[PDB]
Amino acid sequence: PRYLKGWLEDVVQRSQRRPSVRASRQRPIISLKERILEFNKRNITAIMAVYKRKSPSGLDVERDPIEYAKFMERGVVGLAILTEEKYFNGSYEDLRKIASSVSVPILMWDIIVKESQIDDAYNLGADTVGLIVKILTERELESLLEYARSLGMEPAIVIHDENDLDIALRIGARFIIITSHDLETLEINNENQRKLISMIPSNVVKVVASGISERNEIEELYKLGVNAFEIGTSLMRNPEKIKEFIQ
Numbered sequence: 001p002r003y004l005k006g007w008l009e010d011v012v013q014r015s016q017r018r019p020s021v022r023a024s025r026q027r028p029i030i031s032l033k034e035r036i037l038e039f040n041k042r043n044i045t046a047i048m049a050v051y052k053r054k055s056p057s058g059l060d061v062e063r064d065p066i067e068y069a070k071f072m073e074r075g076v077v078g079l080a081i082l083t084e085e086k087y088f089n090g091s092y093e094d095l096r097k098i099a100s101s102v103s104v105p106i107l108m109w110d111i112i113v114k115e116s117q118i119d120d121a122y123n124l125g126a127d128t129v130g131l132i133v134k135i136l137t138e139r140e141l142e143s144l145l146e147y148a149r150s151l152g153m154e155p156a157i158v159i160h161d162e163n164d165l166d167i168a169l170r171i172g173a174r175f176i177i178i179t180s181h182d183l184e185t186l187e188i189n190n191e192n193q194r195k196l197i198s199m200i201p202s203n204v205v206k207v208v209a210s211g212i213s214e215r216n217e218i219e220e221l222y223k224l225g226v227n228a229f230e231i232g233t234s235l236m237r238n239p240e241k242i243k244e245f246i247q
């Protein structure tokens with residue numbers, strides 16, 4: 001990984017040490033990227049709900065993971081499940097239970113630094129993972145992107161800024177998450193969001209993550225050509241908002 005400081009440096013060490021999990025998957029991979037393109041074609045709003053009990057910015061909630069996933073299943077294009085353990089209070093067990101219990105594609109949301117975590121996502125039943133340009137060197141991103149593809153996954157490459165986007169396009173990303181989360185400060189910062197969306201080429205499926213809490217926000221972003229929307233903290237607090245997002 002890159003040289004890092006702070007809570008991200010802690011998580012990267014934790015990820016580096018994390019043992020490979022005993023698990024095996026119960027259905028073939030379903031491409032999240034392709035399901036997004038199918039929603040788009042059907043003129044259906046494509047929401048990726050996130051399951052997480054805690055977040056480094058302070059979310060703290062208890063909700064049963066299988067009940068949340070089944071509630072969400074009919075409304076979402078897919079689910080992102082936290083498996084990072086310390087700051088999000090997730091676990092691979094949450095992903096094992098969810099991916100065996102619902103039919104929609106699953107992204108395993110974690111800080112991925114090594115091939116064996118991608119093997120963990122595959123063996124736990126996930127269809128894809130995020131690879132974060134701020135964590136990884138360009139060489140490690142190329143290597144992990146190819147490794148994920150070799151398992152039949154198309155990973156989402158996560159970007160925060162223009163330097164990240166230049167790397168994501170150079171390595172041949174076809175699936176990007178644009179996040180407004182500042183890893184320092186841990187605040188939502190949308191100042192570059194519109195510019196970055198406008199710089200993503202036609203061959204790349206784009207998803208936004210930015211503390212979305214209103215249908216109006218999704219509406220405005222869809223007009224800019226965003227394909228799907230990662231929504232986490234608002235749905236963890238009020239799951240019933242899924243209707244407002246997709247009605």
Ligand SMILES: c1ccc2[nH]nnc2c1
Pocket residue numbers: 080108109110129130131132158177179209230
């Ligand atoms: C990993 C996987 C998905 C993400 N969405 N925003 N930030 C992410 C990091």
